[PDB]
Amino acid sequence: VFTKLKPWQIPKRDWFSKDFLFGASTSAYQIEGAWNEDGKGPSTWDHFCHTYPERISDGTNGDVAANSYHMYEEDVKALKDMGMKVYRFSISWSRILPNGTGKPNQKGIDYYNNLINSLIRHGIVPYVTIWHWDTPQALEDKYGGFLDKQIVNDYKYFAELCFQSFGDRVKNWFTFNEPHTYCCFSYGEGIHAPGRCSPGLDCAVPEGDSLREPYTAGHHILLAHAEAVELFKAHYNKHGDSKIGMAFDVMGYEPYQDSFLDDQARERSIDYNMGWFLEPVVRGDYPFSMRSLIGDRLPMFTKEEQEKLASSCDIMGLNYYTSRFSKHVDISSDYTPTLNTDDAYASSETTGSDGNEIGPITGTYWIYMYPKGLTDLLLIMKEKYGNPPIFITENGIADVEGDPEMPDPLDDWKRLDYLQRHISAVKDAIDQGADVRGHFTWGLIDNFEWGSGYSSRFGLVYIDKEDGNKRKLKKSAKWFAKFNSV
Amino acid sequence: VFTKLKPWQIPKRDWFSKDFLFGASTSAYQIEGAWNEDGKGPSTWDHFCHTYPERISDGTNGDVAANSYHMYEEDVKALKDMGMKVYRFSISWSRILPNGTGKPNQKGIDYYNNLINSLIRHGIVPYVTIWHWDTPQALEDKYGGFLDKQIVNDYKYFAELCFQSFGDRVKNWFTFNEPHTYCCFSYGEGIHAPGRCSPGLDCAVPEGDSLREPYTAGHHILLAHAEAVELFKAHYNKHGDSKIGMAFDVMGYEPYQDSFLDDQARERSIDYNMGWFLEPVVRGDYPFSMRSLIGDRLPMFTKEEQEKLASSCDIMGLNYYTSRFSKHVDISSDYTPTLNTDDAYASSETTGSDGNEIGPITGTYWIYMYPKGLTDLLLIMKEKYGNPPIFITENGIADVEGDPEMPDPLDDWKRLDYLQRHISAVKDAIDQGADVRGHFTWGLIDNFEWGSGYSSRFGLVYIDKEDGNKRKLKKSAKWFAKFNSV
Amino acid sequence: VFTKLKPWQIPKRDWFSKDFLFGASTSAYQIEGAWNEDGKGPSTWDHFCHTYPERISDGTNGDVAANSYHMYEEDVKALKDMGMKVYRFSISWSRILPNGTGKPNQKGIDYYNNLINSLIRHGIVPYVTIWHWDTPQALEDKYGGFLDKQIVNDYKYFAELCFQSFGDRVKNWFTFNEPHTYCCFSYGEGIHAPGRCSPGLDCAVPEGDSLREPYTAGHHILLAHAEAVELFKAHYNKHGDSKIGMAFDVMGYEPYQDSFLDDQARERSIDYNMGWFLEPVVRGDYPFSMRSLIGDRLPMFTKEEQEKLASSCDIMGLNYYTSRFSKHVDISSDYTPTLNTDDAYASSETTGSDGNEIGPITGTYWIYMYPKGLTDLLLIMKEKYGNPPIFITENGIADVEGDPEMPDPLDDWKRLDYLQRHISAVKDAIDQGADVRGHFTWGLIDNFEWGSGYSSRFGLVYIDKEDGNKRKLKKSAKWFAKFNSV
Amino acid sequence: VFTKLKPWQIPKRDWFSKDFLFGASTSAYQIEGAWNEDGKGPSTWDHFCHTYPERISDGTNGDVAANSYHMYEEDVKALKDMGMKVYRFSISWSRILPNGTGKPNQKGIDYYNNLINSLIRHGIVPYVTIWHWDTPQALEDKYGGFLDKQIVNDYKYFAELCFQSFGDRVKNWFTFNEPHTYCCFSYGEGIHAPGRCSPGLDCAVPEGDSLREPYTAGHHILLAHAEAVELFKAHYNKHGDSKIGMAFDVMGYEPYQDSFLDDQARERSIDYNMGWFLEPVVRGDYPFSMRSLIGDRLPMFTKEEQEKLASSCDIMGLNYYTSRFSKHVDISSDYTPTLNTDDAYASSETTGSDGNEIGPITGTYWIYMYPKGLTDLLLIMKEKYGNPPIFITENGIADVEGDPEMPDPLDDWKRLDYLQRHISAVKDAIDQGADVRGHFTWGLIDNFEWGSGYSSRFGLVYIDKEDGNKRKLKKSAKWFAKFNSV
Ligand SMILES: O=[N+]([O-])c1ccc(O)c([N+](=O)[O-])c1
Ligand SMILES: O=[N+]([O-])c1ccc(O)c([N+](=O)[O-])c1
Ligand SMILES: O=[N+]([O-])c1ccc(O)c([N+](=O)[O-])c1
Ligand SMILES: O=[N+]([O-])c1ccc(O)c([N+](=O)[O-])c1
Ligand SMILES: *[C@H]1O[C@H](CO)[C@@H](O)[C@H](O)[C@H]1F
Ligand SMILES: *[C@H]1O[C@H](CO)[C@@H](O)[C@H](O)[C@H]1F
Ligand SMILES: *[C@H]1O[C@H](CO)[C@@H](O)[C@H](O)[C@H]1F
Ligand SMILES: *[C@H]1O[C@H](CO)[C@@H](O)[C@H](O)[C@H]1F
């Protein structure tokens, strides 16, 4: 049993202002393929699938993906067929600068220009993510990538190349997508590229430090962000018509039990999941809870860095899927952190004190449906962080390959119902005064879901692997066509 | 200008239930004198005035004080004349056990029995504080007093002697009064006996550690408390008619500025000022904020100790005078704590972000009038800590000797107005559901105010030093006589 | 110490609708100079500085001021450089009709036409104040100016000349600016032109009646207003695209103490400060509190006048700077009013019952920062007076010449912070449903601040007296350029 | 149609605390008879019926009334049969001091002692009204009664005689009952004894001043009250077990229409009806609205009088029947007050702006049922005047002689339903925190209703005029017997 909305509860486009923006997202590694064509350099993700293919659940990789490097016109067509106003895509760093640094790859640039111009031809606004986990392996080999401060200037140069090549047409940018997921998975658990973790943990490269490397990578992301935004505002915003921000993964939290301790744990969960990266772009420092618990493992900003970081986003993206219960862990003699996420002293529980799961499972094991958590986080943005302009830059569910209760990949009523509930939760936040400007479904098309490969399908549009990677509208996509009055 | 209540706003006795208790407090060192009579041993406070007399502002000490060791019948008479229902006094450890341990001093015991029996004769209920800063100097010399765990068992034995000698008549007990003030002043700033602080700070004995000794003393107080309460419940409560708790100094806090940082600082101020000692008797551990900021300087409880501490108070005393603004301090490279109170990362400010003091000065430099802070703390007790039974075991103001705006020591309209506002703030909390059971003014009589000597007068009843230490009712006391319908 | 907003609390242009209007104000006498050029007649203010120069604090006058009669193009340029959408300026009655009545001065008219056309050329909307304290001295000499009903028809004719000359281009008008300040200062205290007060008070011309002349002048203003608005609606609004109202000085009030008496005093303060002039344009009579306290000194309206006055504003301006505490004064034998403002029976106090000032001083002695008072008054407009369209037609602070804490006249972070807090308070009112349509800073440029001369600088733009009256953008002005995305 | 409460909405005794007091009231002139027996002097009411019998609607008077001077034991019996805990009765001044002053009438005293002792024998507490409109005609003849200050001392002496004769047994006193009704009717409209009004108005003695005499009488009542209470507290409250206050007639008010003017009118209605007499005993002065509108016709208090009046009631009685709409009247040229009640500038309307009466008629033309008005006034007491102890000292309805819809005088379901609704409204106020201590129905027995004679029956107990003035329990009385569990 999965209870759907009553029909009079289904969102209508008029619930939202005329300037509010509906769209969908993808990322370069997840859809493009052509991983070695036209001069493209390898990324950490090319390298990690090619050297540790067993770390992808279903044995696949992104060498071809949805083949959007050649089929992008079909991605544009599917957006136009759903009536979407915005497409949020990412630039593959390694496609445009094969060595991370130096000579731009002109074919890489032409590709983005082609997609950009096609969107504009079709009345769709491009929102661009500069970096989406996607680091050139040349920079990884040369100095350990995000673990070395040399990443800061190299990223700055990449960002600049984006502004120069695409900024006359692209007016909305996100520097980084999901720094918290990236740091935890790539350098804490190590299940994501480049696959690092502490000795004795199970990841491709157990030569790292799960209590230190995530913070180091994180700190360089934030410094990279501040440099790029400074450069943008000084030399690439002459009309004053362009906006730049960052997109954050966020989970909602509820206290595990009715207890002032779990109330405190909940605030530590949110600092750690959201405030890690958001509190630096707001005030130029990490949350106090994090500095107090993580100490010398969490680098200090200089005064110049504090001030460059504070107020560095015109827009913020929130990538939201699900929520957890937050359960208080005591500081004690018998307990020491082993993963970076242990430093919150709050375990994320899928079941609450009364023995119930937080909401219904939606397909993949980690997406429990809890739209209230999203409205809650949006009200924190409003009340605590100054109500800056929010886009929901990811929201959606997977259908899991071979699941007997999702036998027809186009009949995604479950995805549709989740998306309708979340859009309705965004309406709730807007009615309560939250400054939300858009909703971008993850994903436009089924794509390579990292460690799960293609086996997790997140698209509004089906990618038929047995039929030449053809784009087919699912039931969800067809609802959007009607909703957007196409 | 000091604005008084309008007359229709003045509390009436009927505002409060018939079982609600109005009373006054004193402590042994502050009123008794007779510091070496009838076999009494010296305390840390005898020693500290006799060895470091220059640490008392006005050059005085407690050798004679109000001379309540001989004039207690006049203290009883003054309570009866105001119509008070309760007298909260302390037992001098050194009077009853001159060496801290061993043979009881029978004259010391007789004295308390005399006071107790006189109160009961006069219809007044005795509430007894076992320890009020007042440690035998023999235990201080032998092992450093509260800095050594041997204090735990020695205190237990003292408490037991109290229960045995006085428990057939005394049914309400506080183990300790103001642990937070005691730890900060006696071992942090070192302005109170035994006068210890870090090398390089200005106190009588700069041989201590202002970042460690306060926590050590504190931890032993809490262990001493748990042992005494365990012993009490097991062997001294056979009728089940007796109650035992602890009394805490508390300041109200308001955020310095409208900022989520100062909201966070405020919660750290309250943990540090109130939760330091209260959160152990509630859950058997210190506040998480304190463990996170203080780490190895804050001792761990064993599991037996956690469980003995949790729910160890039947009643709690709140000693309230004033409030502060709490201002957020960042964890940074350039900042290290030097006093224990630095570990809150929240400075207590008397002036707020708009440049105004929190409330009017009342006489002594640290008592700013802010009755709202008291209602607020009472609602935290209710909402956060389970609404346990609260007594206001201290509340009041000083008149400062020689102040030209308080030229007549009996005309204390200012004290009266403050007390009426605070009683009215207690009524506010009770109307909002806070379980408040009594209000004890500090102090019954002018007394030795520690480092300020007699120059700070806190009494409802004037002690005429030029007229044989005679008790004279002030205007405040006379209001109580009417209020209590005498 | 002057605490600034946290950076995430700073208003952004998007807080406000696209039709909301940001602008700045000036007045003719305060900026124009050229006080006797091109046929211009003298005003009461020319006369009052020339006959009583000692009544201007710093010994200056408005003979040249900012020299905007010749430098208006630089005023326009400074508005365009800040990105302002609206300029609210006043018409000098005496420039356009040197004798008050009769032959128009064509050069006077040409001047306004030049400013108007320049604003429109530069995309800026003109909002025009017809009269801003600025009465022709010929009418003052002939019949005592606003003290004689002949002012009513003479003003009507002046207004008509404005509508005829400028109404094809100007579509928003205010008949009068700050009647309450004008009546109190010019005829009560007498510190403003024409400088009248009761015998025995200290003003230039103590031949008046501080209990009667303010009400007489006031009543004629209101009658003048009703005549001009009747004429406007009947003959100068053929497209129905024009709006006409009045602008009121207002202070916020808080009760001095928690007392139903001070609650009553507060409502009398607001009637006297705001309702004096606003309640006539709403219902066609003065507030009942005023008629009850002022009796025969407060003229009666006829029925025709009541009906002409009621609903006579399409738009209202609120000129807001600061707030006061209102303290109840008793009607008693021993007390009689001497100034008109005594008739409120409520003294305006800068300090409250707890001994604190209402908010921080901002430079000049009478501007205490209290943005909450503005939101409060805006909610009274909404809830009590029918939520008519409100413009904040003045709001700002002075920097005082020679103040050692404002040594650099362009570094006006203090002004900027006050303005950001007030804009944010306007946002608060709008979120609570108040119909606020614009915010005009006082002043566009440093100017002649009446009895304080040039020594009080109110501008967003500095007027460099040592550099040829050159316009220089202050830090506040530069913030507006960014805020308005220029 | 008169809609009754649903049965589950009917008050139960347990709705109220165990100390809450249910009782009934009467007054001396209205029930006693024996108007010239045993040495009793005549009152203003004896004189007024005997000289102006045509001013009593039904041609009757109080010469015999209920004959309670001889049948008081039946009044006691009826209270005991209903289970009442309290009887509020008045002392006839003229019975106990036939000449107003001088030799006490011992038989008059014996009578009250007999009633008092009988109540106590029967477990009923006496609450005594010293004066209830009932002035000795000797004082009326000698100096015009309440119009001369000599009434002040004469009343003081009468009160003292009461305290001396009855104070060992009577512990609760009201100095005066309904001063506002008394002043308006006796000296404004003149329909009550001594029957005075302005020349040209229709009353027995149109030789008075309806704009001045009510205030003069009122002011002396208040001075008389302050003197008696001062004397009481100083010499007749040695155990501190006695309480003294005043009882006020009050109507509820609602604004006639939704208009800030009617909101203002409503506050003037309440000041005039309730605050006239209540604001003096609270703060020692009349309401500001009254001083502002009434000026020299409203006498000033001296400072001694202000302070003697302020806080002069331990208890307050509210006599409540009904409510009105308050409609704003303008201060204008064409309008001058003729009756004292015109000075509120607020007409009391029985019908509201929507054309509906405020509530259902209950029998007599002026009692419209509106229990909400009572809860409202009780919350004003709580929120504005300090929540002093309130008794509802009168509340009830008349059955009108010959009314065809009340043909059986004992079947008073209508009275019962009104009383149940009002008791329930008192419960509402108590639940919202109002300090209400008792409910006394007017009246214990049918009695002489002043200008309406016996034709208005207000009793819980019927007085059978055709059967020897026999007491018969009505349906209402029988409900009380059950309610009070008899
Ligand atoms: O586990 N997560 O919270 C989470 C969030 C965003 C993500 O993108 C992913 N992910 O790609 O596996 C996981
Ligand atoms: O400074 N304090 O907060 C504070 C509290 C209780 C106290 O007893 C004292 N004291 O005795 O100095 C001081
Ligand atoms: O004192 N004021 O409230 C006030 C208001 C507006 C004003 O314009 C002035 N003023 O020009 O001096 C003063
Ligand atoms: O008319 N009234 O409001 C009112 C009030 C109390 C009353 O006692 C009377 N009365 O006796 O006629 C009348
Ligand atoms: C947002 O989450 C989705 C779902 O896990 C991922 O595919 C994206 O890459 C991440 F950006
Ligand atoms: C409570 O505070 C008072 C006032 O500072 C001290 O005298 C007491 O000893 C403390 F217990
Ligand atoms: C508004 O107030 C400002 C500041 O006092 C004055 O300069 C203006 O003339 C008045 F309209
Ligand atoms: C209370 O009102 C009742 C009903 O009008 C009168 O009879 C009383 O005398 C008055 F006190």
Swiss-Prot record, chains A, B, C, D:
Disulfide bridge map: 197-203
Q: Where does a beta-D-glucoside bind?
A: 30, 132, 177-178, 321, 394, 442, 449-450, 458
Active-site residues per Swiss-Prot or TrEMBL entry: 178, 394
Query: Source organism's superkingdom?
Result: Eukaryota
**Compartments in which it is found:** Plastid, Chloroplast
**EC number(s) reported in the record:** 3.2.1.182, 3.2.1.21
Q: Does the record bear Transport in its keywords? A: no
Describe the task this protein carries out: Involved in defense of young plant parts against pests via the production of benzoxazolinones (hydroxamic acids) from hydroxamic acid glucosides. The preferred substrate is DIBOA-beta-D-glucoside. Can also use esculin and genistein glucoside as substrates, but no activity with salicin, p-nitrophenyl-alpha-glucoside or substrates related to cell wall components.
What is the name attached to this protein's record? 4-hydroxy-7-methoxy-3-oxo-3,4-dihydro-2H-1,4-benzoxazin-2-yl glucoside beta-D-glucosidase, chloroplastic
Record organism: Secale cereale
Organism classification, top ranks?
Eukaryota, Viridiplantae, Streptophyta, Embryophyta, Tracheophyta
